[PDB]
């Protein structure tokens, strides 16, 4: 994998999770990340 990550780390990343995304909606109200 190009990410240079172990299978355990990849699985941990995967488990954790037209139309506008909620992040964009929050961004469009003066709230940035």
Residues found near another protein in the complex (CB under 8 A): 18-20, 22, 25-26, 28-32
Residue 15: CB minimum distance to another protein, A = 23
Residue 18: CB minimum distance to another protein, A = 6
The sign one gets for the Cα dihedral 18, 22, 25, 30 is negative
> Which of residues 8 and 18 has its CB atom nearest to another protein in the complex?
18
Structure tokens at 2: 């190009």
H-helix or E-strand containing 25? helix 22-27
> Which of residues 11 and 25 has its CB atom nearest to another protein in the complex?
25
């Amino acid at each position: 994998k190009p990410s240079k990550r172990s299978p355990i780390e990849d699985l941990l990343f995967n488990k954790v999770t037209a139309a506008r995304d909620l992040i964009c909606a929050q961004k469009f109200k003066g709230l940035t990340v």
